[PDB]
């Protein structure tokens, strides 16, 4: 079953070996981003509609560990666009994706492009979570931000700051994702009185 999803997603992003010898002579434009996304979304929709409810989440953990196992950032952003349209079309419940994205232990701050693209996608898809899920996401995002040192490199700081926009979006009072009392309760549980 994870073999099925393995064959699907690996057959999505295969790379051509014999190209760069006789470059561009093969008669075939490789599916550009939109057609490839539509085909990927269709095949994953087949596997998802086939899938059972209780098996709904271990496959998503496999998806996110397969995305975080990648190395090319274009590949990662393509599969994140796939996950974004898979949430946007209504196929996926928009809480499992966010939780398995953040609680993935491959998400460390040293993987700065993965950090930036991940928290960009969570900023995209957090608007649909119910408020208790937003509260638990707030807690795990704060605990993810808490692992950064006092000093980091001067180039990675802007890609690290992508979590700050998710935090600013959750604690924004006009957006009203959750009651603000819950937000200050989670914060003051993590930063009690006297802690910067």
């Amino acid at each position: 079953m994870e073999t099925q999803l393995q064959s699907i997603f690996e057959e999505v992003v295969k790379t051509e070996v014999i190209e760069e010898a006789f470059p561009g002579m093969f008669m075939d434009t490789p599916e550009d981003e939109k057609t490839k996304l539509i085909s990927c979304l269709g095949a994953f929709r087949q596997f998802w509609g086939g899938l059972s409810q209780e098996s709904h989440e271990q496959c998503i953990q496999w998806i996110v560990k397969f995305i975080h196992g990648q190395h090319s950032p274009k590949r990662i952003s393509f599969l994140y666009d796939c996950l974004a349209m898979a949430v946007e079309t209504g196929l996926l419940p928009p809480r499992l994706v966010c939780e398995s994205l953040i609680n993935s232990d491959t998400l460390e701050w040293e993987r700065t492009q993965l950090w930036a693209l991940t928290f960009k996608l969570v900023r995209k898809i957090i608007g649909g979570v119910d408020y208790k899920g937003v509260r638990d996401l707030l807690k795990v995002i704060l605990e993810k931000i808490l692992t950064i040192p006092n000093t980091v490199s001067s180039a990675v700081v802007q890609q690290l700051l992508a979590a700050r926009e998710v935090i600013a979006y959750i604690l924004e009072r006009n957006a009203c994702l959750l009651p603000a009392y819950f937000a200050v309760t989670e914060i003051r549980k993590l930063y009690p009185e006297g802690k910067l």
Binding site: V17, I18, E20, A21, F22, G24, M25, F26, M27, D28
Partner: protein, 58 residues
């Protein structure tokens, strides 16, 4: 023996058929570099890819 893959090439006294001679020469001079690229990548020596070098004919 098994087939593995197939790709079609792009389109673009006449008894020579210059295009086929060109494709055969192109495969036979380019495809030695593909095995070298794989054997370099298995020992993780960073390299720019197989490139045309300076003039066109190399």
């Amino acid at each position: 023996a098994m087939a593995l893959l197939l790709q079609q090439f792009k389109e673009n006294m006449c008894a020579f058929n210059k295009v086929l001679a060109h494709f055969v020469a192109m495969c036979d001079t380019n495809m030695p570099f593909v095995g070298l690229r794989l054997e370099l990548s298995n020992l993780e020596i960073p390299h720019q890819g197989v490139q045309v070098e300076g003039d066109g004919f190399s």
